Paper text:
Here we reveal that two atypical acyl-CoA dehydrogenases, ACAD10 and ACAD11, drive 4-HA catabolism in mice. ACAD10/11 are evolutionarily divergent members of the ACAD family, possessing both an N-terminal kinase domain and unconventional hydrophilic residues in the ACAD active site.
To assess whether substrate interactions affect protein structure, these mutants were incubated with 4-HV-CoA and 4-PV-CoA, respectively, before preparation. Analysis of the ACAD11 K* mutant particles revealed an intact, tetrameric structure but only the ACAD domains were resolved.
Author numbering:
A (entry chain A), B (entry chain B), C (entry chain C), D (entry chain D): 375 to 405, 413 to 775
Write the structure that this text describes.
Amino acid sequence: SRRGQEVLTRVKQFMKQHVFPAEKEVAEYYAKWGHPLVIEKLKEIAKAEGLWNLFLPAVSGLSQVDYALIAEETGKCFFAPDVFNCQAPDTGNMEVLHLYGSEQQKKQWLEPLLRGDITSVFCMTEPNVSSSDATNIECTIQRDGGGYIVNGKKWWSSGAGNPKCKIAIVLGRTESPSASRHRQHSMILVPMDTPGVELIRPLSVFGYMDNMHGGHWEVHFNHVRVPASNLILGEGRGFEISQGRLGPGRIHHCMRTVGLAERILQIMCDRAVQREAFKKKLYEHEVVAHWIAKSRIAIEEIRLLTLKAAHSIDTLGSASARKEIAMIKVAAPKAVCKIADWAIQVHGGAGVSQDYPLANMYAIIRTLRLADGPDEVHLSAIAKMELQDQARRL
Amino acid sequence: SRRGQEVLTRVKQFMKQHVFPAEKEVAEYYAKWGHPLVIEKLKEIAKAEGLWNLFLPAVSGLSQVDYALIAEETGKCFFAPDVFNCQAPDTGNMEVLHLYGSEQQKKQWLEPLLRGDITSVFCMTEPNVSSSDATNIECTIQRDGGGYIVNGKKWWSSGAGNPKCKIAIVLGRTESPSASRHRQHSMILVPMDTPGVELIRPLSVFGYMDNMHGGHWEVHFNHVRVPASNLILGEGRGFEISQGRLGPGRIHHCMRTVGLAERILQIMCDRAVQREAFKKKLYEHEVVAHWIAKSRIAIEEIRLLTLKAAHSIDTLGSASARKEIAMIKVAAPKAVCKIADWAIQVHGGAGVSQDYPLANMYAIIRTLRLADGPDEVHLSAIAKMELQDQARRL
Amino acid sequence: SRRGQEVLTRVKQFMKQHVFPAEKEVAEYYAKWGHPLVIEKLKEIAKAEGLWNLFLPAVSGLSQVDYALIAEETGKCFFAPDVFNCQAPDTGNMEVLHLYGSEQQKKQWLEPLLRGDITSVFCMTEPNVSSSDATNIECTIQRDGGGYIVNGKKWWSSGAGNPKCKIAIVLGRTESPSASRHRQHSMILVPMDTPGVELIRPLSVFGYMDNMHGGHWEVHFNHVRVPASNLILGEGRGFEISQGRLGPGRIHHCMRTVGLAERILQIMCDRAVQREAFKKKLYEHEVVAHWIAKSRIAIEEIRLLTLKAAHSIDTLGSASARKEIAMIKVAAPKAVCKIADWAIQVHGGAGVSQDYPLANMYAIIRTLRLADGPDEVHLSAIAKMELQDQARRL
Amino acid sequence: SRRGQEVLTRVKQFMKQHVFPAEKEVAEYYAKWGHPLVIEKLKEIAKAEGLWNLFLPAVSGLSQVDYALIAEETGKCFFAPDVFNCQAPDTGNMEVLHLYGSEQQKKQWLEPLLRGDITSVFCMTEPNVSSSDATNIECTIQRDGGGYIVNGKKWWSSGAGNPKCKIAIVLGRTESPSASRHRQHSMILVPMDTPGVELIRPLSVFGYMDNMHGGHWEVHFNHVRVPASNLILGEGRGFEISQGRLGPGRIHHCMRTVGLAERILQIMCDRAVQREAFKKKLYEHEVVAHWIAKSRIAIEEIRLLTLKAAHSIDTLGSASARKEIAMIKVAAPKAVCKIADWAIQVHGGAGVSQDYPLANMYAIIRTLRLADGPDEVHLSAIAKMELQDQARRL
Ligand SMILES: Cc1cc2nc3c(=O)[nH]c(=O)nc-3n(C[C@H](O)[C@H](O)[C@H](O)COP(=O)(O)OP(=O)(O)OC[C@H]3O[C@@H](n4cnc5c(N)ncnc54)[C@H](O)[C@@H]3O)c2cc1C
Ligand SMILES: Cc1cc2nc3c(=O)[nH]c(=O)nc-3n(C[C@H](O)[C@H](O)[C@H](O)COP(=O)(O)OP(=O)(O)OC[C@H]3O[C@@H](n4cnc5c(N)ncnc54)[C@H](O)[C@@H]3O)c2cc1C
Ligand SMILES: Cc1cc2nc3c(=O)[nH]c(=O)nc-3n(C[C@H](O)[C@H](O)[C@H](O)COP(=O)(O)OP(=O)(O)OC[C@H]3O[C@@H](n4cnc5c(N)ncnc54)[C@H](O)[C@@H]3O)c2cc1C
Ligand SMILES: Cc1cc2nc3c(=O)[nH]c(=O)nc-3n(C[C@H](O)[C@H](O)[C@H](O)COP(=O)(O)OP(=O)(O)OC[C@H]3O[C@@H](n4cnc5c(N)ncnc54)[C@H](O)[C@@H]3O)c2cc1C
């Protein structure tokens, strides 16, 4: 679309003018769970210029392909999505509140989230059970008179340490014997200021604490009392809302991963051209050149897959495109992990040190094979859908 | 396009009605370098219905995307491309004669090729040198008074054993010291009936002789006298014509390979559903299901890459899209080889026997990593182009 | 041992003097299920010099390490094991008859097998079921008065087309409700001259019929009447005898595969040194050199694994070393397959043709991942044993 | 040997009694470049019991196989080698001073190193050049009257931050036009207390600073004046001493890596047995079980390769076994990296957090593909030696 191209050009100009020059200051600030003043100034400027809430089609008037290209543009910096209010944790919560939810819930939580006043956290993983299977959730949401009681322990809650975090969406189980085997979980809105909500400890990733994004935390809900109006949809529709939330998050992460892979490839090519070993440059060795070629091929393939998934979501819907989302979720992280490992090996001993962003990049990409579900469950789902498709064809 | 969709539907109906039922008869006939009468009847029927010369846009009025889908449809059978006059050896020669060549050359050779009266063979590989580097060609094309003399030995000439083969395009070298380092080779039209042209022996592929397609032969040119009007373009433009010929052949092969991969995946899924081992079906074992999922992901990726290359050729040109062609040529054969190996392993001991087409399929796909240039030279070319692109960006 | 070293030196001299020069004649003879006179002369010479039955410790007085080195020596030729009476099909049957069996059975069948008068065939695979799980065998061995009745269809029976094949060992099931879940199968000796035994058709491997080794056949047993004295051990001990037969066959195949890999690596290095492409030799390209290095590393690793398994069998026994045999059976075929594929790619288009033995080599190695059980069942067995070992340690 | 077995049993008892229980205290101490008192007490106890300097055959009276098993035992803990005075940085310097060096140098530096009074650091890598090629070293060691002047910048110097570090071995270049192309570098002993030696900054590995081992530092030598008696051997023998130092370090690292891989496999098996997902345990999924089986196979292979290299060094010498050392250096890190990645994936999100040692383990193993030379230079060396061997055979 013409609007998509215009917004993409404006976003590229905004990044090249403001976002990249502030990287050194942002890194020096974090070398303690909030944002420095540079990010707030950038957010104000982006609000002024209209580069705000580009992820939500109902607000920005953009399709999934246009925002796919835009998110590919903003995936080259680790704090750029937060400048445009398109960061990973809160976007899913805004989508959940926009799709499902009452007028009171929207006016109370979605508007401050849209304006950037507050941030949100999504917590559904337990530390003592296998949470890749969503039926293993043991946190309870029991009705107690006129309200609800939330009691459980959470795990890997991203962004809970941010001082602006005021609302949470908690997935817990309700005992409903008369219901089906899937109508046993519900989502509830729990304010972080409610008595009984405790932040236990932050969680590290390969020795990185990720203070820029608020960190990952262990949260305890000790008999938290919540009004009955904070329950999203009904008392047994947690799985449906989770499925609705999942897809867009995965596609946005895949676009950002494509952008990050492009940045990594640029860095690796620069290093290969610059350095000389054994009386020749690094790219003159065929192994490095073949690494570069394979990286380019993989980047092109994953970008095409993500664009296909975005077009399918546009033309059909978010519920009739689960296979494409599963395929891109399987495909992107492994390819970008291989590219990052090749770049680290090309840079040598400096590839693991703090002189380059390759080590933190590798850690973040490595966590992409576990967050939002491991790759094995997605492979099983793809196999099941493919077998159903073959049975229908035959 | 609407015409593309209509022709695709007609082609699908034609295959399902005529081509697949004749597979058993065609296989029994070959269980000796020509075609049985069933193929000739199918060719006559296809000529009547207008499903003729679909590969050439100037004749069929189709873009590269429409024919990409059509060739994906016809890639599921090993003799289907010959039914529609879209077989690998002669298509490149028709493209060469259509792009370059005089009116006399066109009227003499392209029209019988277009009508299907005769077939052609392209020979540029020598047995005693490394022919992956085109500067190693030692066959000579010397001007002798009013004509030319062709003297050399050829290698892996596909389709030379067909009785309908009457014309050849031979790549040889001419001694031109005043010319550049690339203007040393030329292409000449050599009729197979010329004295001095000898067929030495056929060449086998993993123990398969491939009599259906005319086989692969060693050809000797012993002082062949050829008129000066049989030289295509000039006396030093062999490389340019070779580059013009190369790309469309690769893209058509990639589309047919995608179709073959789809057929292989269907066979493997059928076997996995049917068989039971260790008190469960084969797909109930997670390794087989993950094989199926990875095969589907790879098929989708290679199809998207081929469609991207076809669209780029449509919108820009065959000379400004070499990078995409190189990427698809690298990507498709390895993925389809892995899929075929997985299918053979799934079928067990019967995966290598004559009860299934998987072994011949694997042999043919394995030769795709060597024919039309190995994968390593393409990887080097991709690396060079990517480095140039990075230098231009920086 | 000193005897092992002396026999190894004598075997090396015998190969270099007689076996390699006859390769061209043997190949020309087969370019129809028996042996040419050259092989018979070589067998007579080997009998005269005492290089006979080197595989059996009770006859040759050699341990498993000495014969491991000897079989590594004889693995470089495809008919060399038959010169020393150490070929794959009959060796297992000799081991079975030597370990288990009565005096009458030994005097009737093992002595002609030891002298080389007759050959044997082992058949336990069915065409219409999954035979990787041995409980799926549907062939019946019912007691009928004073004898037994064998009724079933066999599959992939190696060596059944040899005119010297006179005896077979057939695995079938007996209905014994009072027995356990494993005491349901038995092995019986069935002469090939018995009425009701039919050879149906030979089976091809990638288009190779393997006439040198007698081929692989489909055999039908149509109500074959057999005396009760032809039953090995008891009526429900088939699994035990099968387990006893399995291990030595696998270790001998692994040693021969190591030898074949060494030959393949020598051929590939010769080609890489000889040829020149793009103004440099093939080994001057780093990819080819890295292929060579990885091939050498893999060869060393698999040889060490096989020697470890042989020493373990020597010092402990064939029943307390199943884990090592499973590991070598998993490890050797994949590494040698990768080496063969690299060599084929190095040779170029000639790597698939009949000018070199690489294509037939690849086909034979590819069948090693399916014969004597697939790799997946061995991986599952290794995982089970490793979990038991960890539980015992903890 | 009997002594080797007795010392191995004593070492196993010592570890199980003292080293493992202190892991929690050691971890809590570091959660600042020296050792806590627990390690010093363990060192005193090990000195009392005679488990001291087990790496040096001239002191312990042990071969390379016995110490290979012992180092495999001590590779399961990250501070265990330091308890027995067998830690990576100083062992190479002790070997260098033991092989080469004068009586004064030995009495001054080797004896305090042997008794554990001081530690050493080896520095030969420069930050601004490619140091994988040893001819790129730009640090200068110029003779200045009665002594030497060392001027250069070092990089990744391990253990320089330890307060006990008093001596260094620096590799620099000397301008000798009359000498050969390899006699251009020399090794000199530089005390850390000499004026002009500066510690610039520590270097991180994936966000880990590794304070336990003294860290990795950037060191500057600003016109350091050193007496002429501190030069090891001559003024142009740096390469020879470097080659002598290299091999034993690699073999010890490989043995410790095998031990670490065994520990990782034990942890992964424990997790797979414990956890349950999708109504079954983790090992009941075939992918996890196949991961376990492949890990066991790889561990066995690398252990056999290391033992073969140790036996070859014992029976022939450290100069006629470079091929085996290169092969093990290539083989061990990649296999252990794959095993560690599989274990991290098995543990899920907790695989990257601080609750388990898998993330730090992966970082340390990942640096093993770069330290002591990258894998690509070793692959090139192996290819060269293999080509020489093939040429000699032919
Ligand atoms: C944990 C750790 C500890 C260390 N400790 C020490 C220490 O105590 N002392 C010390 O002196 N150094 C130490 N180092 C440094 C280490 O020795 C070097 O990083 C390594 O030798 C390579 O040096 P470099 O960084 O200059 O690599 P570079 O040469 O700059 O890397 C270029 C890359 O190109 C590739 N390459 C290079 N040559 C070839 C070729 N011929 N063919 C193909 N590809 C090729 C490789 O992937 C290589 O990594 C340590 C490093 C680490 C990570
Ligand atoms: C060259 C050659 C020679 C042979 N010679 C003989 C001979 O002399 N005698 C004889 O009796 N047989 C012989 N065979 C047959 C051979 O033993 C069988 O092919 C093999 O044992 C598997 O039998 P199948 O074909 O029924 O495999 P199937 O069970 O039908 O194959 C199914 C596939 O599923 C997979 N699979 C199976 N179980 C599992 C599991 N638990 N987990 C995961 N994946 C699994 C495997 O990939 C397997 O290949 C020969 C075969 C070949 C190729
Ligand atoms: C089924 C089939 C059909 C064919 N049909 C035809 C036909 O119709 N017409 C025709 O002219 N030819 C045909 N060929 C031949 C084919 O084009 C050649 O085999 C191919 O181009 C390579 O030629 P070569 O055998 O000389 O390879 P070689 O150059 O001899 O192979 C050397 C090997 O070295 C490697 N290598 C080469 N260059 C590099 C590099 N720069 N970097 C790294 N590695 C490198 C590659 O692995 C290559 O295979 C056919 C081949 C097959 C298998
Ligand atoms: C950086 C990061 C951020 C995160 N942020 C959040 C967040 O904001 N909110 C949140 O709720 N969670 C978050 N998580 C947690 C994440 O969602 C979980 O780690 C993940 O969903 C798996 O949960 P688990 O740890 O219980 O895995 P487990 O189930 O304990 O892992 C077991 C392992 O077994 C394997 N496996 C599982 N099922 C199968 C199967 N069917 N077939 C084969 N293999 C299988 C997989 O390898 C899996 O990793 C985050 C995690 C990370 C690393």
